[PDB]
Design a protein around this ligand. Structure first.
Ligand SMILES: *Cc1ccc(-n2ccnc2-c2ccccc2)cc1
Ligand SMILES: *Cc1ccc(-n2ccnc2-c2ccccc2)cc1
Ligand SMILES: [Cl-]
Ligand SMILES: [Cl-]
Lengths: 228, 6, 228, 6
């Protein structure tokens, strides 16, 4: 759809749509930028991620409202509308996974980009898993697990424990464990060692990096407080 | 219910 | 788009989309219901209004963010994107006005329905006026004024001063005066006599009607405090 | 800036 617009204009308009809270537009602009074929900078990867997380975030929130109504009732209308939203959500997840597979991940050599894209891959398979009920549910769960696990292996080899991508990856993999894989003990163990090893590496950081890392550590702490 | 990266 | 769905299912799904905060869906469902050709009940008119007010409300908020950026700067990107949002907003206003004209207003005989639809007509011409800059700006302003004025004439003949539709109509017509027509004195005069004549009719109301009326009177009061 | 019916 965006093939006739300059890459740089797509990026510029992506930022404008973020300011205007037009995240569907923002996602379409970043999709167009990705399809230019060039690798994405650190800032551009964030823009892509913010756009689609917000789009899929509203679809997940709506799916949960509708699936809760549907459960409390079990005419076809509630099921039909939940299925409509669910289908739209799956379409957005498939689009993100398609962009990662064509060709963001295969061209990502640096740990920061490769971990970032593998984290996204795990997240969007997680969102697919949240709505899955058929024969492919186990396969979707394992795809999320496989992406997260490769990201974790790289991040532990290549990044310091306070690295924000590393910390966000561990946070989300632990949510996966708790929420999708029925492994609350694995979720708690990962959140705690991630938090403890980040604590020990804070002394190496500047004030701004310290602020970045402790923000995400506090989300790990919030979950540990919820889960124990 | 739990927090993923926000 | 909705021609194959039952009217009652469209209404049911409209309510579901409201609960899920899916207002674009809600608007499309209510559009489909309107296009069934039957008049709308009191509750259905509210659903139609809530859906499109929320859709156009987000477009206006985005337009204002972008037009503010555009002003602070004056590449073509900011203008282009503001024009994209503005065009989408105009499309939604044209769709609502089209539904009112085909054929909601001509079939509305009761004061409650006719005032309600004429108020909507004035509102969506007001939203068109907010973004208008060409030769048709004056004509758009007069269309909003004409719709509001017919609504006001009917409401004063046919409704008590505390009627919520009457009060909401007067609130919005006074915003028109202040914000669009450059008539702040007319805006203040209408807000004050509307508020004062509602005060005097509260003694006739039940507790629930009292709550309904004083809620909208407080918006009139807030504006008077802003404007004086 | 001013309030219309909400
Ligand atoms: C999933 C995720 C985790 C952390 C961050 N984050 C926080 C602060 N800076 C960053 C960042 C991560 C990657 C690239 C640039 C910035 C974002 C997303
Ligand atoms: C524009 C507008 C003004 C008032 C109301 N309102 C408030 C409480 N009830 C209602 C109402 C109006 C018309 C039909 C049903 C309810 C709504 C909209
Ligand atoms: Cl549906
Ligand atoms: Cl554009």
């Amino acid at each position: 759809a965006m093939g006739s617009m300059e890459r740089a204009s797509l990026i510029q308009k992506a930022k404008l749509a973020e300011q205007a809270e037009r995240y569907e537009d923002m996602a379409a602009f970043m999709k167009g930028a990705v399809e230019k074929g060039e690798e994405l900078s650190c800032e551009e990867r964030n823009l892509l991620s913010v756009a689609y997380k917000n789009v899929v975030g509203g679809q997940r929130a709506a799916w949960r409202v509708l699936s809760s109504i549907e459960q409390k009732s079990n005419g076809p209308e509630v099921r039909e509308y939940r299925e409509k939203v669910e289908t739209e959500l799956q379409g957005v997840c498939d689009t993100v996974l398609g962009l990662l597979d064509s060709h963001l991940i295969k061209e990502a050599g640096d740990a920061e980009s490769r971990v970032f894209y593998l984290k996204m891959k795990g997240d969007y398979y997680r969102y697919l898993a949240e709505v899955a009920t058929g024969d492919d549910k186990k396969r979707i769960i394992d795809s999320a697990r496989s992406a997260y696990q490769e990201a974790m292996d790289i991040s532990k080899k290549e990044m310091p424990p306070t690295n924000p991508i590393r910390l966000g990856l561990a946070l989300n993999f632990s949510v996966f464990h708790y929420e999708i894989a029925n492994s609350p003990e694995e979720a708690i163990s990962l959140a705690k060692t991630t938090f403890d090893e980040a604590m020990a590496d804070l002394h190496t950081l500047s004030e701004d990096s310290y602020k970045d890392s402790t923000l995400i550590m506090q989300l790990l702490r919030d979950n540990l407080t919820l889960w124990t | 219910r739990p927090s993923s990266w926000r």
